[PDB]
Design a protein. Sequence first.
Lengths: 383, 383, 383, 383
Amino acid sequence: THVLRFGGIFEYVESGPMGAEELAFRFAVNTINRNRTLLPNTTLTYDTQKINLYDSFEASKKACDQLSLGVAAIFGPSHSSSANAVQSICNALGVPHIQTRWKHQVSDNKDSFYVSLYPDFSSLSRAILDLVQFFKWKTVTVVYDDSTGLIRLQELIKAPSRYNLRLKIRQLPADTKDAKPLLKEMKRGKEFHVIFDCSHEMAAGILKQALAMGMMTEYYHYIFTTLDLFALDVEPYRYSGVNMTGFRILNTENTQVSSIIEKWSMERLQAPPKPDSGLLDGFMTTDAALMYDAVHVVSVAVQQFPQMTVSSLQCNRHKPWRFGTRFMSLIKEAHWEGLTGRITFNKTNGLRTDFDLDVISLKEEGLEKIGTWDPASGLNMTE
Amino acid sequence: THVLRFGGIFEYVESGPMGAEELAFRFAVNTINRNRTLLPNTTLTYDTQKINLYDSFEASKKACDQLSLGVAAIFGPSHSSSANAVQSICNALGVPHIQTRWKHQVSDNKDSFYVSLYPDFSSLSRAILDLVQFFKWKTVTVVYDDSTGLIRLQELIKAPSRYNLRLKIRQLPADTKDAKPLLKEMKRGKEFHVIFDCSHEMAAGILKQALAMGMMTEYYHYIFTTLDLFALDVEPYRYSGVNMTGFRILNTENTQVSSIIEKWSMERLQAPPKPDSGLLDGFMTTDAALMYDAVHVVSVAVQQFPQMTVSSLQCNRHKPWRFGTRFMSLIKEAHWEGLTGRITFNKTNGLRTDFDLDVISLKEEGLEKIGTWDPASGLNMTE
Amino acid sequence: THVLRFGGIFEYVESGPMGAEELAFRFAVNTINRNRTLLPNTTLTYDTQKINLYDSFEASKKACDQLSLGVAAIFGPSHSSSANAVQSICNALGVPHIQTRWKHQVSDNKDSFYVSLYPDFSSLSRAILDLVQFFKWKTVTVVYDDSTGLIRLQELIKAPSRYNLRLKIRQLPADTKDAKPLLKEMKRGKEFHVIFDCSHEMAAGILKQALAMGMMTEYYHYIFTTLDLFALDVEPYRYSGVNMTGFRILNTENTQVSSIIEKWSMERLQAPPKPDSGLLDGFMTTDAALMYDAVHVVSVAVQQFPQMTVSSLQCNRHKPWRFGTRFMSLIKEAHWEGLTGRITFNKTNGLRTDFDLDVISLKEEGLEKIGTWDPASGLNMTE
Amino acid sequence: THVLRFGGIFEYVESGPMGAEELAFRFAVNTINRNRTLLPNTTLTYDTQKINLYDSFEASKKACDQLSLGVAAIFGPSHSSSANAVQSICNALGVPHIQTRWKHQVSDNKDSFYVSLYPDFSSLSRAILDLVQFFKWKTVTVVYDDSTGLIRLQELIKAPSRYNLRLKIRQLPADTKDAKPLLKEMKRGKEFHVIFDCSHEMAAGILKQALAMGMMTEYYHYIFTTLDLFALDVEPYRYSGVNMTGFRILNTENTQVSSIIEKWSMERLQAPPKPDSGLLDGFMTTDAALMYDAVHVVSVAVQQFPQMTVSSLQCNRHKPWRFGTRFMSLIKEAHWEGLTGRITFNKTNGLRTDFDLDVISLKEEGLEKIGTWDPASGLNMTE
Ligand SMILES: *[C@@H]1O[C@H](CO)[C@@H](O[C@@H]2O[C@H](CO)[C@@H](O[C@@H]3O[C@H](CO)[C@@H](O)[C@H](O)[C@@H]3O)[C@H](O)[C@H]2NC(C)=O)[C@H](O)[C@H]1NC(C)=O
Ligand SMILES: *[C@@H]1O[C@H](CO)[C@@H](O[C@@H]2O[C@H](CO)[C@@H](O[C@@H]3O[C@H](CO)[C@@H](O)[C@H](O)[C@@H]3O)[C@H](O)[C@H]2NC(C)=O)[C@H](O)[C@H]1NC(C)=O
Ligand SMILES: *[C@@H]1O[C@H](CO)[C@@H](O[C@@H]2O[C@H](CO)[C@@H](O[C@@H]3O[C@H](CO)[C@@H](O)[C@H](O)[C@@H]3O)[C@H](O)[C@H]2NC(C)=O)[C@H](O)[C@H]1NC(C)=O
Ligand SMILES: *[C@@H]1O[C@H](CO)[C@@H](O[C@@H]2O[C@H](CO)[C@@H](O[C@@H]3O[C@H](CO)[C@@H](O)[C@H](O)[C@@H]3O)[C@H](O)[C@H]2NC(C)=O)[C@H](O)[C@H]1NC(C)=O
Ligand SMILES: *[C@@H]1O[C@H](CO)[C@@H](O[C@@H]2O[C@H](CO)[C@@H](O[C@@H]3O[C@H](CO)[C@@H](O)[C@H](O)[C@@H]3O)[C@H](O)[C@H]2NC(C)=O)[C@H](O)[C@H]1NC(C)=O
Ligand SMILES: *[C@@H]1O[C@H](CO)[C@@H](O[C@@H]2O[C@H](CO)[C@@H](O[C@@H]3O[C@H](CO)[C@@H](O)[C@H](O)[C@@H]3O)[C@H](O)[C@H]2NC(C)=O)[C@H](O)[C@H]1NC(C)=O
Ligand SMILES: *[C@@H]1O[C@H](CO)[C@@H](O[C@@H]2O[C@H](CO)[C@@H](O[C@@H]3O[C@H](CO)[C@@H](O)[C@H](O)[C@@H]3O)[C@H](O)[C@H]2NC(C)=O)[C@H](O)[C@H]1NC(C)=O
Ligand SMILES: *[C@@H]1O[C@H](CO)[C@@H](O[C@@H]2O[C@H](CO)[C@@H](O[C@@H]3O[C@H](CO)[C@@H](O)[C@H](O)[C@@H]3O)[C@H](O)[C@H]2NC(C)=O)[C@H](O)[C@H]1NC(C)=O
Ligand SMILES: *[C@@H]1O[C@H](CO)[C@@H](O)[C@H](O)[C@H]1NC(C)=O
Ligand SMILES: *[C@@H]1O[C@H](CO)[C@@H](O)[C@H](O)[C@H]1NC(C)=O
Ligand SMILES: *[C@@H]1O[C@H](CO)[C@@H](O)[C@H](O)[C@H]1NC(C)=O
Ligand SMILES: *[C@@H]1O[C@H](CO)[C@@H](O)[C@H](O)[C@H]1NC(C)=O
Ligand SMILES: *[C@@H]1O[C@H](CO)[C@@H](O)[C@H](O)[C@H]1NC(C)=O
Ligand SMILES: *[C@@H]1O[C@H](CO)[C@@H](O)[C@H](O)[C@H]1NC(C)=O
Ligand SMILES: *[C@@H]1O[C@H](CO)[C@@H](O)[C@H](O)[C@H]1NC(C)=O
Ligand SMILES: *[C@@H]1O[C@H](CO)[C@@H](O)[C@H](O)[C@H]1NC(C)=O
């Protein structure tokens, strides 16, 4: 009988229930504890702490508390300022750091003990660039929201120096959802081919404002960078004649994965979606799908390593954990068929640049898979 | 008799002498200790610690050591990953954090206790954009080096959506100085109007490689984003017929400032510039000029606040410093005429968006001031 | 066992080692003395004297000293003022005079006893004129250094009276290497097609100054009159996109000749090339290559004439040497395959107007043979 | 009573009488010996030797014979190959060398003991260049005879790089007076503005052949480089309507000079001019006029130096003559009003670049002075 303790550092909300990632972290730990073939005779427990996500000092205190109590991994603070602080703690004290969201990896950072399960925007900007070639675009307009979106789509911005695109980079307004002065300039500029770098909460907001202005016609085509395009109530836009392409790594066409999504709406039951926020009703985001996967990919590594004993490391007397070097190598060699497809890592750095997308577009009936993407193959679009 | 202790967290070098910022921090503290009108009867001492600059854990330990010994300010780790960790420590424990280099301020960071003395690239990208209007450019090519340079020049990249520029964003090769495959594509692409986002060490390297390929003619024009264009041995390029514009905030035309630059070459004497690195011989970089200024701008605040007593704060029992709220307000209200012009801060956030540049170009005689820039006025170019 | 004594009159240097011609004269005499098939059972010795090269009185004293001791040939004073004095001594006293450098032969000079091994500029000005036809030039600019260069390139200057060239004859500054006021007039005059009449020491100097001004672009083409274009460190100019044509009589593509060039760097070892003089490291000049050949071509004549006995001639009682008439006819009928190709003489006067050049140009990889020249054939340019 | 012995090295003719320079050397020495104010109580004697003029060995033997007998000056071998040999003898042994004909002074010749009385072609090529400006020429054709004529007229050849001339350099045939294939190309090329670099013997020959072909019309203009244009029987060309410009330094408009020219035809009486050689009957050439002057300019120096004693110098034991340094300085400071105008020398090198020409042209009446030239003033053409 073993007691492994996966750490976690999640968002602190005062009014609603626990977040989507903290639910999926608790739902995953309960899944391996019930299921018997994966990790027999062990009992995964958890040590979830809650932070502000914008406080690198508070994230570093909770990371040293989890190392003092003793963890075998830390499943990310999930924000760029807080994740870089906890990554360097986990690098110095041996213990792995599991990331499920994208952040800017600075080029001269010699950190080994981290893996990210979010699909890398080195690969995702090539998938978007393959679509604008397939659709024969020449007047692309990238619309992002925050200044880090330039780093995300940098291979798309450098594309007119190797092809015949003509980019017109624009930015959403600072914090307000008043995208109407942006969309007036896009409508007057005759820009019919738009790539949005947004989240699905902000994709839904500007799609209501593109309806009310001029822009949900059969002349406009919208590629979406977000992987949660399948979580939009697209009922006002089905008959609109529009073309709305995108991607989806959440492999919802398996019977096994769709079983878990149907289980997900049960225990989540609280926090209903407010009506003028036209996301769909019951779904896993790809944010929570990668946190459900991250517990399983580390679980592949602990099944291949049974003699693990959790130690109580100390930050101001920082010494590496005894099995931190081998167990990190088992996480970077782990293969898993999770909610988000195949999960293999990039041996050099530790990212997911090898993954399987599903190109989805908006048809009259609904929002349907019209192709596939694969870094080896490319676009296999059976449209 | 007072004993104020300004902290500092600088780069650790194993072979050469102390860095340019740590020299200028020691040279500034010795200057106020000698000079009598600024801070009478007090003695500024220092507590310089040395880190790797790429280790947010090591930067956070040295910041808690300086808070344990007791400081009244921390003069920056001077790298983006390390500065964001020490900013959140200084925000939680009251003590100000003085920054002298640019880093990405994420938009939802509610940090108050920090000021940056580096000229903001919100203002510097408008100064570069005013030059490409004045020079009547329409085929601009931005060349940057690291992925954060997109965030720096984002107002220049968004400019073809409000003017008639046609940007072609390119990137230098990853770490090597083999910019020849980049410059072949720029020469074959007939790109004569280039903006380089580099440092002066990398500006000197690609200017040697632009000479040897095709590109230092009278057809090519080079705007440089760096503020240390005046520190290039431009003797191979004076008669080249080229046009090489740029900026300079280091106000070298005063008798008072040029006295300090002449003092600077004396005590620095070690570490000579190697010959195939064609920077000039004796100069302050704008990196060290802002660290000389940062000690003085905080010195204006302590002259207006004589009853300051340094306290010994603790990180794991984090309580704000007693005078941290008032003394931070005096730093954000400080005015100073330093090496880099007028130093006034941006009351909203804490940046320098109000500063005085000097547009310099390459003439046959040398590298001379051909104008001025000011966020209020604009380009007053007496060419 | 014979003792033949070839005379020699070379440059007197006070600081460095012996000159390139005096080394090659000593290296050649040692070669025939070792090698057995050419001249069996004889031992060539030498009688090298050193002069100022600008003193026809001192050159005439050393020539009468060598005739008093007794020589069978004199291998040139190698300067125009000194060579004409020693030519008339050798004509009056019978003994041959071997020349390895060009000088102005006045038309009414009835001298028989001399041969020159330097390629005649009657033939070399036609080879340059064939290149400006092949390259379809019409705006040729000849740049020479001393006033005798007009005599050298006179068939190139008389060419617009039989073709459609438009010559613009210019001269380098008097003694200084300040060719920048010359190159300003050539750049402002839009003169992209330049023929330089220089030595390789002065070709290297003005190529550094053409780089620093405007002129090493892909618009400028430089034909070089010198036969030592292969002895330039052209590493700063390979990627420059320039076109730099020229000639080479030193037949470096044979295994036998390249063996001797590899032997040459061994014994020469002293006198390294100073860095800002960007000639290559180890090479025979064509000046020393013709002095290595001149000992061998005379050696062909003494193998065909075994009964030669060296006599002690006197200048103030001038009587011709007994075998001077026959042995001079054997030198003018000698054939040899030396370092500089085939060596046959011009029966009428005694020059080399029949020789084999190798047209070399500057490519991106290096400086490569792009054709051939031959007075019979013409340009066979397999470019 | 003194006995000064001026040396001389002149041409050896086998059939006719002594040459024009040797007559004028004997006529000048007889003139100072008769006349009493210039050199009282001294008796100039002479030591004229005769050479082949194309033998630098024979010229060097006669120069050492005159130094052995003892001379105070040597009045030139008067040919370029022979003069450079005797110049270096006179430089090494102290004794001055007086030149009366042009030769190529190589630029790195450090010879002090020589003066030339022939007008320098540095100044004479500017006088020809001032005429082609005054006559508003733009299609100039230079015709020379030997390859040294390029060195003579080099400032005229370099003139299209600073003005709007368009030179077409041509050469007379090698030795024959068959200039008809040259004049066919000049007539077919529509070249009406011709500069001839010739002697007056060859100017008369090609003027007979320009009459018989097409070219003595009112369309053709001929500038002559020779200073003996006044010695042409121009009676067939007076009414021809031609324009034939030229120069004249022989100052035939003085009563004193025209007395000497009338004396000259008396003692010369032998050697009549053959009819088909249409030079005039009785005249001093400027060759003999400068030899008459050269004895007088040296005579100014010996009047200012009475204690001169002629010494017997030796060539193979070469030691400078005791008063050679001072007496050479008196020749370079001598002023004289001779047959050829004012005779002042060029302190730097020793040439005549300051002289007074007389521009003469062909009118219907005869060949008349139409202007003046002076290096200070320029063309004062009272036409
Ligand atoms: C509960 O059972 C297993 C617990 O191990 C869960 O994961 C699976 O673990 C086994 C251990 O090697 C592997 O079996 C695979 O099962 C899938 C069923 O979809 C089948 O397609 C494969 O050929 C193989 O038999 C596998 O590593 C892993 N499954 C996957 C998809 O990676 C399993 O997910 C849990 N649920 C059920 C309903 O079994
Ligand atoms: C592990 O990580 C490295 C670096 O992230 C991966 O290297 C990258 O691999 C791709 C494919 O070889 C390189 O080229 C790109 O490929 C697309 C394929 O669609 C092609 O269309 C483009 O020509 C594009 O250049 C990419 O440059 C390369 N990056 C570097 C720095 O070498 C590597 O593939 C990963 N290993 C895996 C996934 O096994
Ligand atoms: C010691 O530090 C004091 C700092 O106050 C220096 O005194 C003054 O410092 C500033 C230079 O930043 C100057 O004051 C200003 O001058 C302008 C005109 O240039 C005037 O408009 C302002 O009202 C203000 O006075 C001033 O140059 C300088 N004072 C003097 C006399 O130079 C002081 O120079 C420092 N001492 C040493 C030895 O460096
Ligand atoms: C304190 O900070 C804020 C922002 O950090 C400063 O406001 C900024 O002011 C500039 C100039 O007025 C605005 O930028 C540009 O104005 C130019 C005028 O030519 C024009 O090309 C564009 O329309 C562009 O907007 C900038 O928008 C504005 N920032 C914000 C967020 O509104 C403010 O001036 C600072 N206070 C000081 C220096 O006292
Ligand atoms: C010693 O000198 C003799 C000179 O005869 C060298 O023998 C031969 O010299 C010439 C090189 O100039 C070559 O002869 C010719 O070769 C061509 C083919 O390359 C052939 O067509 C001719 O019929 C003639 O034979 C030849 O390379 C060379 N002989 C050998 C065996 O290499 C001899 O090489 C000199 N010895 C040394 C040690 O250098
Ligand atoms: C011995 O010497 C004489 C001259 O030193 C050589 O004669 C010269 O031969 C060349 C070539 O045939 C003639 O030059 C040029 O011919 C080209 C053919 O393309 C043409 O562009 C011109 O018409 C030009 O004349 C040159 O005129 C001629 N020289 C003389 C004085 O006739 C002779 O070939 C030598 N003997 C040998 C190498 O056996
Ligand atoms: C014979 O008499 C003198 C001998 O000395 C010859 O040359 C002249 O020498 C005197 C001595 O200084 C100078 O007199 C000048 O005479 C000319 C007459 O043309 C006059 O114009 C001057 O104002 C001055 O009085 C002078 O240096 C020199 N003459 C010249 C022209 O340079 C003279 O040439 C001989 N013949 C006659 C007829 O006197
Ligand atoms: C002594 O000899 C030197 C060198 O031969 C003479 O120097 C030369 O003098 C002229 C006049 O200053 C220079 O310029 C030329 O002048 C003409 C006048 O008509 C003018 O039109 C042109 O602009 C032309 O450049 C010439 O360059 C200069 N040479 C050198 C090497 O400096 C000097 O004048 C002589 N001294 C005398 C005659 O007192
Ligand atoms: C949607 O996609 C189809 C197929 O690529 C294309 O024909 C159509 O024009 C697109 N709609 C747009 C661009 O509005
Ligand atoms: C596209 O998918 C089909 C069906 O799975 C398969 O033939 C192959 O993977 C792809 N086709 C091509 C031509 O690559
Ligand atoms: C540099 O300045 C000159 C003169 O103002 C002008 O050619 C242009 O502004 C620049 N040169 C270029 C772009 O070649
Ligand atoms: C720019 O030039 C002068 C120099 O300082 C300045 O005084 C003037 O006011 C400015 N001109 C403008 C802003 O038009
Ligand atoms: C050099 O060669 C290239 C290719 O043959 C051609 O541009 C031309 O011949 C030369 N280049 C010039 C004159 O710029
Ligand atoms: C030039 O090229 C080849 C290569 O050596 C040569 O054999 C051939 O005879 C020549 N071709 C001609 C002269 O047409
Ligand atoms: C001779 O000179 C006059 C005056 O310069 C000129 O008018 C005439 O045309 C000239 N004769 C020619 C060029 O044949
Ligand atoms: C031309 O000569 C006249 C008369 O000798 C005289 O006025 C002056 O020297 C010259 N005139 C000018 C204007 O130079």
